[PDB]
Structures are given as structure tokens and as C-alpha cells.
Symmetry: C2
Subunit: 147 residues, 2 copies
Amino acid sequence: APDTRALVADFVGYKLRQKGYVSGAGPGEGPAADPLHQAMRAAGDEFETRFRRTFSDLAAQLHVTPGSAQQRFTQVSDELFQGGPNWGRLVAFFVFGAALCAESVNKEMEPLVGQVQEWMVEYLETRLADWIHSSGGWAEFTALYGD
Amino acid sequence: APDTRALVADFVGYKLRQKGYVSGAGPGEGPAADPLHQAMRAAGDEFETRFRRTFSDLAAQLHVTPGSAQQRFTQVSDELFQGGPNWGRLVAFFVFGAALCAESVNKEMEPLVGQVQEWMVEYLETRLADWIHSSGGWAEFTALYG
């Protein structure tokens, strides 16, 4: 199994720099050097930009053909009630963790960042060990999200 | 059955006002006249402040009982994977619709506000009618969230 530590740290570090809470070298700096890392980055970016893309799509449709925007609204709304893949809750979790880190840096509790990551690693190692391995493992994840 | 148009108007108007996009008389300004409306407003408030309240609770564990902070994170994470009740998806739908309207105003596309509200009403009355009935009807929602 992949080094969860290095995954968590790449994603969180990626997000912190993206948002401007951190800078310079270290994890999350420049491109991901590991397809699992790249897949999680992409999963997280997709997750956080979903609302904005949806709005633009609906605004666009509003003058493709009539009824077109309403039909797309129905399709996207259906997803809220179906849900996304189960892998979606893992993406949600990483995004949640990274947001906890960002707020930490924002409220001047920098050491909280290091411990959030540690809590993340440990949760994935113990709690989701079976959920992850079941769903197809990290390899399956990297296929669906990584390109 | 509740007046869906009025519920949608109240919730979206409440949110637009709460975030400063509109002001003045109209749905969502002032007390809700219908218990279902008040329940949805409260549901949507809880939903949209949940991250901030979670961060507040975690930071307070650190500032008070650091030893049980990891436990708390695990509990919240657990809850995140369980994935809440059916009604939580309906709350998410109302929050989503309000966010579309808010973004329509922000982006100077006011027509879309009226269109999104009509789409929400049609969705609730037709597409989601069975799902709401199955989940126990509007009365149950109101009881749970009000």
C-alpha cells in the first residue's frame, strides 16, 4: 500500500499554496510526482470547482435551446439525491482535511496543520483500511480520477 | 401539501438577504409565517455553518482538552463517511438552489433567479414528489428540523 503520509501531505500542501496560505518548497510544491498524488489533486480541484462550473453550464444552456437549462438543472439535482461514487466521500474527506488546515493557518494556529495531517493519516490507516481496500484500493482510485 | 413556490421563495429570499445580495420587504425578510419555512431556514443555516462549527469545536478541544481532540476528529470524519439522513440531501438541494440565485445576482444575471426558483418548484412537485413522500413527507421534515 502507498505511503498515506506522503499523499495527505501532497494534497494539503497543494491546497495551502493554491489558496495562498503557504509558499516555497516542500510537499505540494509544483506538479505531483506520483499518479495517486495527481489524481487526488484533480479530484479535489473538481470537487471545489463543481458549483462554479454548474452555474456556468446552466447560465450557458439558458440560451442553447429552451428547456435545455431546466433539463440540465434536473440532471445535476438528481446527483445530490443519488450521490457520486463512494470514492466521492474520500474526496470529500481530503477536501475537509485541507480546509481544516487552511482555517488553522488563517486563525494563526499553524501547529494545528501538522496535527490535522497526522490525524488524517491515522484515520485512513485504521478506519478506512477496509473501505478503501474494498472499493478497489488506491489503484482503482487513481484510474478513475488520475487520467 | 405545502405551497412549494412559497417555501422556495422564502428560503431563497432569506439566504439572499442574509448574505447582503438583496434588502427590503419580501419573502425571507422577517419572521417566517409557516413552520415549514422556519424549519428549512434553520436546516439551511446548520448546513452552511457546519464546517465553521466543526472547526470551532475541534479548536476548542485543543484549547481545553487537547487529549480528546483526535477522538473528536474521528467522530466527525466517521459522520462524514456514514453520510447523513435522506433529509440532508433535500437541505443540500435548497442550499444549492439558493447559491445559484445568489451567484445570479452577483453576476448580474437576475433573470436566472426567477428561472432557478421555477426549476426548484417543478423539481420538488414532480421529480422529487415520490422521494419526499417516501422519506416521510413534509410534516416529518418540519418535525425533525423545526
